[PDB]
Homo-oligomer: A and B are copies of this chain.
Amino acid sequence: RFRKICVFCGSHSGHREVFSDAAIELGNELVKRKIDLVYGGGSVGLMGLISRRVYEGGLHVLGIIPKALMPIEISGETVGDVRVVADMHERKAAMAQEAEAFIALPGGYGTMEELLEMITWSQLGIHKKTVGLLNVDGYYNNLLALFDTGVEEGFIKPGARNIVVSAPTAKELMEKMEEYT
């Protein structure tokens, strides 16, 4: 049973409704399960939608963002708390620490970098937290093929491939991450 999670996404929602709509479903799952949210502090894109839902849903919303990135990811009128930090690094250690599991929701390079990093810490044993993945409309099928390529070729261990918990819907992803211990 989780107390909070740090979803990874960006300032874009994606052209097709499935991505934004997928982000709304994750928010609704977090609300129903009474789980607080940790994220990049962005007030727009999938980040805006995610915290926007959990906030209104009641649960706590803790955003974490680097000083210089604020003019980029925060526009409009902020909702929820933000613990500004030094830079990308502090952000990296701030998103983990202040959170539990990790759903690296569909996103761009920043989000990809965040996912690979959390899995990397679990692989090395730096920390022991569930690393999930919401594979909306197969957006990550490729990334899911690269991990294996790494296994088959010998750069990733067969067991280490099991660090990634993915599903096509927020509902199943949450169940999976709750049905694995």
Residues on A facing B (Cβ under 8 Å): 10, 12-16, 19, 69, 88-89, 92-93, 106-113, 116-117, 119-121, 123-124, 126, 139-140, 142-143, 145-147, 149-150, 152-156, 160
Output the least CB separation between A125 and chain B (Å).
Answer: 10
12 interchain pairs (CB within 8 A)? A14-B155, A15-B153, A16-B153, A107-B155, A108-B123, A108-B155, A108-B156, A108-B160, A111-B155, A112-B116, A117-B117, A140-B146
In the complex, what distance in Å separates the CA atom of A26 from the CA atom of B10? 34
Given contacts A113-B116, A126-B88, contact A107 B140 (CB under 8 A): no
Identical chains bound together, number: 2
B119 near A155 with CB under 8 A, answer no
B107 near A150 with CB under 8 A, answer yes
Output the least CB separation between A91 and chain B (Å).
Answer: 10
A150 near B92 with CB under 8 A, answer no
Residue among A119, A142, A149, A155 with the most chain B CB within 10 A? Answer: A155
In the complex, what distance in Å separates the CA atom of A13 from the CA atom of B156? 11
In the complex, what distance in Å separates the CA atom of A17 from the CA atom of B145? 21
In the complex, what distance in Å separates the CA atom of A160 from the CA atom of B14? 15
A15 near B89 with CB under 8 A, answer no
Top 6 closest A-B pairs, CB basis? Answer: A108-B155, A113-B116, A142-B146, A89-B89, A15-B154, A142-B145
Q: Which one of B113, B139, B146, B153 lies within 8 Å of A120 (CB-CB)?
A: B113
Given contacts A113-B113, A143-B143, A146-B112, contact A154 B120 (CB under 8 A): no
Residues of B within 8 A of A145 (CB): 142, 145
Residue among A110, A121, A150 with the most chain B CB within 10 A? Answer: A150
